[PDB]
């Protein structure tokens, strides 16, 4: 099953209390960018050594309680440090100011590289800690099995797979630090339906 599950449709939650000094949502709320922001840059003469840069989290606007759900996104290749995965409401309150009984999961992206958190319970063959960043990354959350899988959509290949606690509501979760960007992707099937609509509604005579 190419997308292993039904495509889960959502947008970035403008109301989750994200840090809007450092994170900017685009007009559709389907892209988030990390920025230094005005307060830092207007005070930049004071910075000669460095600065404590917060990791700024944001979640999707729609929760998962049950079932199998898939979604995909593009991380900007230049991104300093980005995390992507899932998080329960409990964990979110910390971030927003055995594996199976851990209620979140994140992989780290940066420098156009995908970082595999760990490989336990799989001695088969030495696996890379660093992979090239896929132009498009997929997540499959299976609440029945309590598993989350991360996919390189360029190669159609699972990169990482982990037990996760689904006893409570889970949200698509993201975090950005330094400059970076994440764009939520729509399946090509959505594009072909958009085209039908544009031709049906918006094709006039001269």
Residue numbers in the entry: 506 to 602, 627 to 735
Quote the authors verbatim.
Conversely, the TRIM36 PRYSPRY domain has characteristic loop insertions, which also affects its oligomerization state. The crystal lattice of the TRIM36 PRYSPRY domain contained four molecules in the asymmetric unit, forming two essentially identical symmetrical dimers. This observation is consistent with the TRIM36 domain eluting in gel filtration with a Superdex-75 column at a retention time corresponding to a dimer. The dimer interface is formed by a helix-turn-strand insertion between the canonical β-strands 2 and 3 of the PRY subdomain. The additional β-strand, β2′, self-assembled into a two-stranded antiparallel intermolecular β-sheet, and Phe543, Leu545, Leu547, and Ile552, located on the helix, form hydrophobic packing interactions with the adjacent monomer. The total dimer interface area is 1803 Å2 for chains A and B, and 1875 Å2 for chains C and D. The same PRYSPRY dimer interface was also predicted in the AlphaFold3 model of the full-length protein of TRIM36, and the related TRIM46 homolog, in addition to the typical dimerization via the coiled-coil domain. An unusually large insertion was observed between the canonical β-strands 5 and 6, featuring an additional helix and a long disordered segment. Another noteworthy feature of the TRIM36 structure is a unique helical extension at the C-terminus. A systematic analysis of this canonical substrate-binding region in the PRYSPRY structures determined in this study revealed significant variations and distinct surface properties across different family members, providing intriguing insights into the divergent evolution of TRIM family members. This canonical binding site was accessible to a varying degree in the domains crystallized here, except for TRIM36. In this case, dimerization via the insertion between the canonical β-strands 2 and 3 effectively occluded much of the putative substrate-binding site.
The tripartite motif (TRIM) proteins form one of the largest subfamilies of RING-type E3 ubiquitin ligases, comprising more than 80 members. TRIM family members typically contain a RING domain usually catalyzing ubiquitin transfer; one or two B-box domains mediating protein–protein interactions; and a large coiled-coil domain region, which is involved in self-association or oligomerization with other TRIM E3-ligase proteins. About two-thirds of human TRIM proteins feature a PRYSPRY domain, also known as the B30.2 domain, in their C-terminal region. All characterized family members shared the same overall PRYSPRY twisted β-sandwich fold consisting of a 7-stranded and a 6-stranded antiparallel β-sheet.
